[PDB]
Amino acid sequence: SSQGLLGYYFSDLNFQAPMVVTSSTTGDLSIPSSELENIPSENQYFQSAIWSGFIKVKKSDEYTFATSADNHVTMWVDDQEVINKASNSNKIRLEKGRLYQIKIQYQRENPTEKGLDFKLYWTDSQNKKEVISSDNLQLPELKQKSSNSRKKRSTSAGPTVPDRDNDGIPDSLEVEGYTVDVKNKRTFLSPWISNIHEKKGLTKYKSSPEKWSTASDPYSDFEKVTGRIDKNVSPEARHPLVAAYPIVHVDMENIILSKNEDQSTQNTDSQTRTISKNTSTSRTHTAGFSNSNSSTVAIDHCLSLAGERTWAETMGLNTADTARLNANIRYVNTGTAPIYNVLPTTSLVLGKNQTLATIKAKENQLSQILAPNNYYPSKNLAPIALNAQDDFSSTPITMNYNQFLELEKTKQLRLDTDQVYGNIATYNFENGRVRVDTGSNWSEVLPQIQETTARIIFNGKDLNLVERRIAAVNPSDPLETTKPDMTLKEALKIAFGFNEPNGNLQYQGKDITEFDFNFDQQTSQNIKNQLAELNATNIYTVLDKIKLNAKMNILIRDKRFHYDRNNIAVGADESVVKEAHREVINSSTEGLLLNIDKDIRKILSGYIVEIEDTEGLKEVINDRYDMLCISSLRQDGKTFIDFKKYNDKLPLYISNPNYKVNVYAVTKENTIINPSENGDTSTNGIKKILIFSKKGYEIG
Ligand SMILES: [Ca+2]
Ligand SMILES: [Ca+2]
């Protein structure tokens, strides 16, 4: 349980040096020395302490309060002192259902025991005395605004530990650095100490003492580090310097095109003449400073239907007909916080700006959460059809004849999704629960997050673009200057899980030098200036010295690949592609069996197989632009390149053992997706990469 009173335990006598900040479920406010391993022995002596929260009683009555050390205690119930350095029997009247503020201060110089043994009791009218039970105690209202029943500030009477933003973490800890450690029941927040915490691999937190959420998101610095937060929030965004917010795009998995019924045609019994294709969708980035969500859909160009007809020929579309599109999609959350009750609206766009459809889900009628690193619907469930089978009111996604031809030519669609994400599930200090709060909305949060953080977009996870935002100083905004300095190195560690085992920063085994850096213009000039000030000629050797600022944009990409203007991986150097195909497991006249890196496979559209005779002439076996999909990933994760698929199901016939079998890879950026202007559907002129070449006698 995360409920109870909030305690600050200080090594000094005057509430200045907080050693532990933690909560207690019951009136037992003790911290035994056995729980103090993350703090120096000499600091395990607590000379002062402050507790705060509320008391709720289940039964109106007159109660008497008392503690383990009334001679060292002053206690207030709603601004009223009930204990002052003396035990008493003064009976204060408490009404059922009503919430009373509690503040307790304790001071004792030169304690002879480490830790603190301290209990809060009360006695009712029937002379029954007990340690106050957990059902009667609540945390203070550590929010930016008071509740109707719970005031956000403690009584003005007595000591006030500096907590300028009311998040619960004392100013001094947020500025100087703190660590969070878990017991079995409780989280201790303590000052960072180099020689003890660094070796334990603990995380060193700093945050702004004047920003309740330092990332300007809806979860407080204290809520984050103490686990008083939506469990669906990404682990990295439990750091007060990492922004927690949703990021959504749409993934289209496949498409079906068909001819629209028309009033003039009474006949609806004709044969099916649809065009069904698989599609590949990637979230894009156009270095940029737009906070837009967009994804681009590539429609499969591989052979699907008999013949080499035009799409219009296939569907029987005349120049006056219209065509319809249906598709299967899912929503993808690549951000750091969940969505509960509004999915963002999406435009489906042909060419630069021809909106074909507006895709909307029903507000407050979501079938599940849309969680970070997850899909809606979940992958274990059917996807959403744009025109659902049940749904009478799904709008047809229609194209006129020329739009249809444009789609055939480009084989591309774009999905632009807005940033309307609905209500937020927040922590409630009254009951220690997380629930969707109707009074909290992502639209009130996103602008501030964007304005006060540096954005890093990184593709090291499967070459897909993942955006994170990290709290970073704005030298021009006084409030933002109260945040800790954020270095480029630290940002990569906390936002993306880079680590540094041997003084080299790595992402899952890959050195940082295996990725490039790309910035928007303002950011570029900023970083260039820093490097010059540092007398540094190479960014990779000074990542710990490069400071991020709010509104920076940083794009970091795997160096092995070529990228299009949407920053999607579309190719790779010849040398990289060749090497990636080096180790052959098996070869025969039936095909090749290779092990290919998963990332490499992502940028290949297909393979061309060829037999080269003794005079140097070449027979291309699968000699069509739509016949290059001859590779498949097997269960054992190896790739098979199938020579027979487009050889009429026959093994390669090699007339002479000195003939060669040549296999070439074709990257996405070099892929032909239409017949040439002259109508040629062959592979002639395709830019291709030789990846295997062996003579007949070397194959078998
Ligand atoms: Ca604070
Ligand atoms: Ca703070």
UniProtKB/Swiss-Prot annotation:
Region Domain 4, binding to the receptor: which residues?
561-700
What does altering P651A do? Great decrease in toxicity due to decrease in cell binding
Q: Where is this site: Alpha-clamp?
A: R164, L173, F222, F429
Q: What is the effect of changing I527A?
A: Loss of toxicity due to defective oligomerization
- Composition bias of kind Polar residues appears in 263-284
Binding positions for Ca(2+) 1 per the UniProt entry: D163, D165, D167, I169, E174
Q: What is the effect of changing F222A?
A: No effect on LF-binding ability and as toxic as the wild-type
Resulting phenotype, F392C:
Abolished ability for mediate LF and EF protein translocation
The UniProt comment on domains reads: The molecule is folded into four functional domains. Each domain is required for a particular step in the toxicity process. Domain 1 contains two calcium ions and the proteolytic activation site. Cleavage of the PA monomer releases the subdomain 1a, which is the N-terminal fragment of 20-kDa (PA-20). The subdomain 1b is part of the remaining 63-kDa fragment (PA-63) and contains the binding sites for LP and EF. Domain 2 is a beta-barrel core containing a large flexible loop that has been implicated in membrane insertion and pore formation.
Protein name, UniProt field: Protective antigen
Originating species: Bacillus anthracis
Query: Upper lineage ranks?
Result: Bacteria, Bacillati, Bacillota, Bacilli, Bacillales
